[PDB]
């Protein structure tokens, strides 16, 4: 049952970025949060890529897959 989330997640991010280099790095950001498991790291990179409000959805976009506990803490770290 867990598969479309990837398409909707990748399709959404692509709808916002529409770029490749950006998605590559953003894809790298997620890969990092997976290995290092450091929410503080995701926020940093996500910013460098989401420096503009236009890429705001990335926060709410990634949250879903982001651990329920980390989701809240993710909110505590983010001002929005």
């Amino acid at each position: 049952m867990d598969r479309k989330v990837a398409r909707e997640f990748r399709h959404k991010v692509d709808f916002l970025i529409e770029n490749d280099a950006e998605k590559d790095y953003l894809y790298d950001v997620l890969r990092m949060y997976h290995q290092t498991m450091d929410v503080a790291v995701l926020v940093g990179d996500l910013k460098l890529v989401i420096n503009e409000p236009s890429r705001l959805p990335l926060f709410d976009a990634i949250r879903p897959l982001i651990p329920l506990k980390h989701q809240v803490e993710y909110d505590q770290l983010t001002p929005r």
């Binding site: 867990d2 990748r10 490749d20 998605k23 997620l30 949060y33 997976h34 879903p64 897959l65």
Partner: peptide, 18 residues
């Protein structure tokens, strides 16, 4: 819904190799 969707999308890209 935790520690499952991440690998789904993460690995999905790992397969795409884009």
């Amino acid at each position: 819904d935790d520690d499952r969707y991440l690998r789904e999308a993460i690995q999905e890209y790992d397969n795409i190799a884009k």
